[PDB]
Structures are given as structure tokens and as C-alpha cells.
Design a protein around this motif. Structure first.
Motif, PDB file in Angstrom:
ATOM      1  N   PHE A 165       0.813  -1.220   0.000  1.00 51.46           N
ATOM      2  CA  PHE A 165       0.000   0.000   0.000  1.00 51.46           C
ATOM      3  C   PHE A 165       0.842   1.264   0.000  1.00 51.46           C
ATOM      4  O   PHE A 165       0.552   2.220  -0.729  1.00 51.46           O
ATOM      5  CB  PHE A 165      -0.917   0.004   1.221  1.00 51.46           C
ATOM      6  CG  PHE A 165      -1.991  -1.036   1.143  1.00 51.46           C
ATOM      7  CD1 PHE A 165      -3.279  -0.694   0.697  1.00 51.46           C
ATOM      8  CD2 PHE A 165      -1.714  -2.377   1.476  1.00 51.46           C
ATOM      9  CE1 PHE A 165      -4.259  -1.658   0.589  1.00 51.46           C
ATOM     10  CE2 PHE A 165      -2.705  -3.344   1.396  1.00 51.46           C
ATOM     11  CZ  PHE A 165      -3.985  -2.982   0.929  1.00 51.46           C
ATOM     12  N   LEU A 166       1.881   1.271   0.834  1.00 51.10           N
ATOM     13  CA  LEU A 166       2.648   2.484   1.042  1.00 51.10           C
ATOM     14  C   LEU A 166       3.441   2.871  -0.219  1.00 51.10           C
ATOM     15  O   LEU A 166       3.532   4.054  -0.548  1.00 51.10           O
ATOM     16  CB  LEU A 166       3.567   2.343   2.252  1.00 51.10           C
ATOM     17  CG  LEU A 166       2.835   2.068   3.571  1.00 51.10           C
ATOM     18  CD1 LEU A 166       3.838   1.538   4.610  1.00 51.10           C
ATOM     19  CD2 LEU A 166       2.147   3.358   4.097  1.00 51.10           C
ATOM     20  N   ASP A 167       3.951   1.878  -0.942  1.00 55.34           N
ATOM     21  CA  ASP A 167       4.742   2.161  -2.144  1.00 55.34           C
ATOM     22  C   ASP A 167       3.970   2.981  -3.193  1.00 55.34           C
ATOM     23  O   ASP A 167       4.569   3.718  -3.975  1.00 55.34           O
ATOM     24  CB  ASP A 167       5.238   0.866  -2.817  1.00 55.34           C
ATOM     25  CG  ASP A 167       6.371   0.185  -2.053  1.00 55.34           C
ATOM     26  OD1 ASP A 167       6.969   0.813  -1.133  1.00 55.34           O
ATOM     27  OD2 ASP A 167       6.668  -0.996  -2.399  1.00 55.34           O
ATOM     28  N   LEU A 168       2.644   2.850  -3.200  1.00 55.29           N
ATOM     29  CA  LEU A 168       1.818   3.504  -4.190  1.00 55.29           C
ATOM     30  C   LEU A 168       1.971   5.003  -4.153  1.00 55.29           C
ATOM     31  O   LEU A 168       1.709   5.647  -5.177  1.00 55.29           O
ATOM     32  CB  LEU A 168       0.334   3.174  -3.952  1.00 55.29           C
ATOM     33  CG  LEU A 168      -0.037   1.682  -3.889  1.00 55.29           C
ATOM     34  CD1 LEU A 168      -1.525   1.550  -3.508  1.00 55.29           C
ATOM     35  CD2 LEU A 168       0.244   0.942  -5.197  1.00 55.29           C
ATOM     36  N   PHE A 169       2.382   5.550  -2.996  1.00 54.22           N
ATOM     37  CA  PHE A 169       2.320   7.001  -2.797  1.00 54.22           C
ATOM     38  C   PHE A 169       3.682   7.661  -2.759  1.00 54.22           C
ATOM     39  O   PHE A 169       3.811   8.840  -2.439  1.00 54.22           O
ATOM     40  CB  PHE A 169       1.407   7.374  -1.622  1.00 54.22           C
ATOM     41  CG  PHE A 169       0.002   6.936  -1.851  1.00 54.22           C
ATOM     42  CD1 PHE A 169      -0.808   7.627  -2.757  1.00 54.22           C
ATOM     43  CD2 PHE A 169      -0.473   5.763  -1.272  1.00 54.22           C
ATOM     44  CE1 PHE A 169      -2.096   7.187  -3.040  1.00 54.22           C
ATOM     45  CE2 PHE A 169      -1.756   5.296  -1.554  1.00 54.22           C
ATOM     46  CZ  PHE A 169      -2.583   6.013  -2.432  1.00 54.22           C
ATOM     47  N   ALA A 170       4.702   6.872  -3.064  1.00 53.47           N
ATOM     48  CA  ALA A 170       6.010   7.438  -3.362  1.00 53.47           C
ATOM     49  C   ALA A 170       5.799   8.450  -4.491  1.00 53.47           C
ATOM     50  O   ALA A 170       4.977   8.220  -5.396  1.00 53.47           O
ATOM     51  CB  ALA A 170       6.979   6.342  -3.812  1.00 53.47           C
ATOM     52  N   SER A 171       6.553   9.545  -4.459  1.00 56.02           N
ATOM     53  CA  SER A 171       6.326  10.650  -5.396  1.00 56.02           C
ATOM     54  C   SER A 171       6.483  10.230  -6.848  1.00 56.02           C
ATOM     55  O   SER A 171       5.872  10.825  -7.726  1.00 56.02           O
ATOM     56  CB  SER A 171       7.283  11.817  -5.103  1.00 56.02           C
ATOM     57  OG  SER A 171       8.618  11.408  -5.346  1.00 56.02           O
ATOM     58  N   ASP A 172       7.322   9.215  -7.086  1.00 60.42           N
ATOM     59  CA  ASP A 172       7.627   8.734  -8.431  1.00 60.42           C
ATOM     60  C   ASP A 172       6.920   7.423  -8.818  1.00 60.42           C
ATOM     61  O   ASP A 172       7.269   6.794  -9.831  1.00 60.42           O
ATOM     62  CB  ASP A 172       9.143   8.595  -8.606  1.00 60.42           C
ATOM     63  CG  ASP A 172       9.805   7.706  -7.542  1.00 60.42           C
ATOM     64  OD1 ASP A 172      11.051   7.554  -7.624  1.00 60.42           O
ATOM     65  OD2 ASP A 172       9.120   7.194  -6.618  1.00 60.42           O
ATOM     66  N   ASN A 173       5.913   7.017  -8.041  1.00 58.10           N
ATOM     67  CA  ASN A 173       5.197   5.771  -8.358  1.00 58.10           C
ATOM     68  C   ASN A 173       4.053   6.063  -9.333  1.00 58.10           C
ATOM     69  O   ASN A 173       3.299   7.028  -9.154  1.00 58.10           O
ATOM     70  CB  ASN A 173       4.699   5.078  -7.063  1.00 58.10           C
ATOM     71  CG  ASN A 173       4.211   3.652  -7.293  1.00 58.10           C
ATOM     72  OD1 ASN A 173       3.141   3.430  -7.849  1.00 58.10           O
ATOM     73  ND2 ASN A 173       5.015   2.678  -6.889  1.00 58.10           N
ATOM     74  N   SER A 174       3.918   5.228 -10.368  1.00 61.66           N
ATOM     75  CA  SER A 174       2.851   5.429 -11.340  1.00 61.66           C
ATOM     76  C   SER A 174       1.444   5.291 -10.748  1.00 61.66           C
ATOM     77  O   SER A 174       0.512   5.872 -11.294  1.00 61.66           O
ATOM     78  CB  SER A 174       3.012   4.497 -12.541  1.00 61.66           C
ATOM     79  OG  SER A 174       2.924   3.140 -12.130  1.00 61.66           O
ATOM     80  N   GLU A 184       9.615  13.319   3.268  1.00 59.94           N
ATOM     81  CA  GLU A 184       9.784  12.355   4.362  1.00 59.94           C
ATOM     82  C   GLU A 184       9.085  11.044   4.078  1.00 59.94           C
ATOM     83  O   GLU A 184       9.619   9.967   4.379  1.00 59.94           O
ATOM     84  CB  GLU A 184       9.336  12.945   5.694  1.00 59.94           C
ATOM     85  CG  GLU A 184      10.411  13.821   6.285  1.00 59.94           C
ATOM     86  CD  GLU A 184      11.725  13.079   6.393  1.00 59.94           C
ATOM     87  OE1 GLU A 184      12.690  13.453   5.689  1.00 59.94           O
ATOM     88  OE2 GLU A 184      11.795  12.114   7.170  1.00 59.94           O
ATOM     89  N   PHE A 185       7.902  11.121   3.472  1.00 60.58           N
ATOM     90  CA  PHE A 185       7.232   9.890   3.077  1.00 60.58           C
ATOM     91  C   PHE A 185       8.130   9.084   2.137  1.00 60.58           C
ATOM     92  O   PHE A 185       8.367   7.866   2.374  1.00 60.58           O
ATOM     93  CB  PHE A 185       5.886  10.150   2.421  1.00 60.58           C
ATOM     94  CG  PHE A 185       5.140   8.881   2.096  1.00 60.58           C
ATOM     95  CD1 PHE A 185       4.367   8.237   3.083  1.00 60.58           C
ATOM     96  CD2 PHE A 185       5.224   8.317   0.819  1.00 60.58           C
ATOM     97  CE1 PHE A 185       3.677   7.080   2.812  1.00 60.58           C
ATOM     98  CE2 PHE A 185       4.537   7.129   0.522  1.00 60.58           C
ATOM     99  CZ  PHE A 185       3.766   6.498   1.520  1.00 60.58           C
ATOM    100  N   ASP A 186       8.660   9.758   1.104  1.00 61.62           N
ATOM    101  CA  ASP A 186       9.547   9.079   0.152  1.00 61.62           C
ATOM    102  C   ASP A 186      10.730   8.437   0.883  1.00 61.62           C
ATOM    103  O   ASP A 186      11.112   7.279   0.592  1.00 61.62           O
ATOM    104  CB  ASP A 186      10.117  10.059  -0.880  1.00 61.62           C
ATOM    105  CG  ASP A 186       9.197  10.291  -2.077  1.00 61.62           C
ATOM    106  OD1 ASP A 186       8.006   9.896  -2.070  1.00 61.62           O
ATOM    107  OD2 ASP A 186       9.694  10.910  -3.037  1.00 61.62           O
ATOM    108  N   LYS A 187      11.314   9.189   1.819  1.00 62.51           N
ATOM    109  CA  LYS A 187      12.469   8.728   2.574  1.00 62.51           C
ATOM    110  C   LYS A 187      12.140   7.419   3.272  1.00 62.51           C
ATOM    111  O   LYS A 187      12.873   6.451   3.150  1.00 62.51           O
ATOM    112  CB  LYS A 187      12.912   9.779   3.606  1.00 62.51           C
ATOM    113  CG  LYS A 187      14.217   9.425   4.333  1.00 62.51           C
ATOM    114  CD  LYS A 187      14.455  10.335   5.507  1.00 62.51           C
ATOM    115  CE  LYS A 187      13.696   9.835   6.728  1.00 62.51           C
ATOM    116  NZ  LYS A 187      13.961  10.685   7.917  1.00 62.51           N
ATOM    117  N   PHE A 188      11.027   7.389   3.994  1.00 65.34           N
ATOM    118  CA  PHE A 188      10.658   6.197   4.757  1.00 65.34           C
ATOM    119  C   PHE A 188      10.308   5.004   3.845  1.00 65.34           C
ATOM    120  O   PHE A 188      10.788   3.877   4.079  1.00 65.34           O
ATOM    121  CB  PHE A 188       9.483   6.509   5.705  1.00 65.34           C
ATOM    122  CG  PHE A 188       9.820   7.467   6.829  1.00 65.34           C
ATOM    123  CD1 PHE A 188      10.891   7.230   7.691  1.00 65.34           C
ATOM    124  CD2 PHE A 188       8.992   8.573   7.073  1.00 65.34           C
ATOM    125  CE1 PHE A 188      11.159   8.131   8.770  1.00 65.34           C
ATOM    126  CE2 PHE A 188       9.247   9.470   8.133  1.00 65.34           C
ATOM    127  CZ  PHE A 188      10.341   9.245   8.978  1.00 65.34           C
TER     128      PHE A 188
END
Ligand code: NA
Length: 227
Positions: A165-174, A184-188
């Protein structure tokens, strides 16, 4: 097989109102998730703790649930919705908002979007909400191209890992259709997903921090869980 249904908000543009965290929170505060699941849907859906479903992932050392450890920052409170929208108006320098919610044209999806539209519109003076229920390929295409203000969709876990679930919201995720972008989200979330995340206790803490970060600035608006 646990799923979270959520509403993404279009944050692509520097001047998008949805880049304001207080507006995103005002929207979340205005939706009575208990009523949605109990009166509107009545289909086994439950209130969402957060983004990662409850009763899905356990701490790698003890028996603790991810959602319980993360806590919840999802509240229904229309007094707070109004207060946060007042803050957003001042910060953004706007008086009004007209927003469309793109959704599925499925029967339950229409009842969800109707309830969400009424809730936001009713709670926030100066906000008007429209809805656009459409078939799957249209929703997908518009979601990718950013042709929406809000879009309701969801995610189901092939395996019971919170990073699904969390990977979906990385800034660079499609899959990040609204282009939420929190450093910070990306970092974690990256620290967790890296091939060099070989310490399971650090990885767990990174994922917990990711959940708390996106819920803390309401980067996406979870609506319910269906598990
Ligand atoms: Na209104």
C-alpha cells in the motif's frame, strides 16, 4: 485479500488547492466513515484505521498489528472540517472551491461517491462538489493523465505486506495518481523497499513512519477497508 478504498486528490499543479494539507484534512474530517460503512454500504466494509489495512500485517518480533502500532489519524468531525477549511482559505488565498470526484459507475461506487459528495459539500461553506461516474478504462486513463480533481479507487494486497500500500504514494510511483509528494514519506517508504533493507526491525519502523507521515498530512483520503 484486504483492501482499502481511498480518494486521491490532484496535487500535480503548484497552485492546486489540494496541495494544502489543511484542505485535505477538512475533506477527511467531513466524511462520517461509520455512516458510510454501516448505513450506506452495509456490505462488510469497515471504518479505515488508515491506509494500510488492519488485521493484515504483524510486527516481525512480537504479535502486534501494523495498524494498531501506527495508530489512526482519521476522524469525523464537521466542526473541525469547518475550522480546517477556514485555515486553507487563508493559506491558499481562495474564497471558494468547485471540485469533481471521478469514480466507478458501479452501483456501490455510485452510492459511496454520492455520500462523499454530499458530506463535503454540506460541511464546507463555499465548496461545491460534482461527480463523474465512469467505466474502468476511462477512470484509469483520466487518473493517469490528471484529468480529475478527486478520484475514488482502491488497492488490494496480493501479499500481506504494508509496503504494498505504502509504495503507491512514493512521489515517483505510477499508481500515485494525485502526485502526492512528501519528501519524508519518500524517505521512509524507499528505505523500507530498498534491497538494502535487510534489518526487519528498521524496515518495520520505516513502514510505520511512512503510514504516520501520509496520514499526518492526509496525502490520500481513505474511505473504508474491506478485508
Ligand atoms: Na458547501
Amino acid at each position: 485479500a484486504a483492501s482499502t478504498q481511498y480518494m486521491e486528490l490532484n496535487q500535480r499543479d503548484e497552485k492546486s488547492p489540494f496541495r494544502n494539507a489543511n484542505l485535505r484534512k477538512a475533506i477527511s474530517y467531513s466524511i462520517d466513515r461509520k455512516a458510510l460503512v454501516e448505513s450506506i454500504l452495509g456490505d462488510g466494509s469497515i471504518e479505515p484505521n488508515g491506509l494500510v489495512p488492519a488485521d493484515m500485517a504483524k510486527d516481525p518480533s512480537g504479535g502486534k498489528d501494523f495498524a494498531k502500532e501506527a495508530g489512526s489519524q482519521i476522524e469525523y468531525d464537521t466542526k473541525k472540517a469547518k475550522e480546517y477549511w477556514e485555515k486553507a482559505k487563508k493559506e491558499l488565498g481562495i474564497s471558494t472551491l468547485t471540485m469533481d470526484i471521478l469514480s466507478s459507475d458501479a452501483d456501490s461506487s455510485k452510492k459511496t461517491v454520492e455520500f462523499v459528495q454530499g458530506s463535503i459539500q454540506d460541511a464546507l461553506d463555499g465548496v461545491k462538489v460534482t461527480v463523474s461516474p465512469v467505466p474502468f478504462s476511462v477512470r484509469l486513463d483520466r487518473s493517469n493523465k490528471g484529468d480529475f480533481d478527486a478520484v475514488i479507487g482502491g488497492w488490494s494486497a496480493d501479499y500481506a505486506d504494508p509496503s504494498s500500500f505504502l509504495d503507491l504514494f512514493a512521489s515517483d510511483n505510477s499508481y500515485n495518481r494525485g502526485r502526492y509528494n512528501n519528501a519524508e514519506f519518500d524517505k521512509f517508504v524507499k528505505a523500507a523497499s530498498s534491497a538494502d533493507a535487510t534489518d526487519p526491525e528498521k524496515r518495520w519502523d520505516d513502514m510505520l513512519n511512512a503510514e504516520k507521515t501520509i496520514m499526518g498530512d492526509m496525502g490520500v483520503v481513505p474511505l473504508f477497508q474491506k478485508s
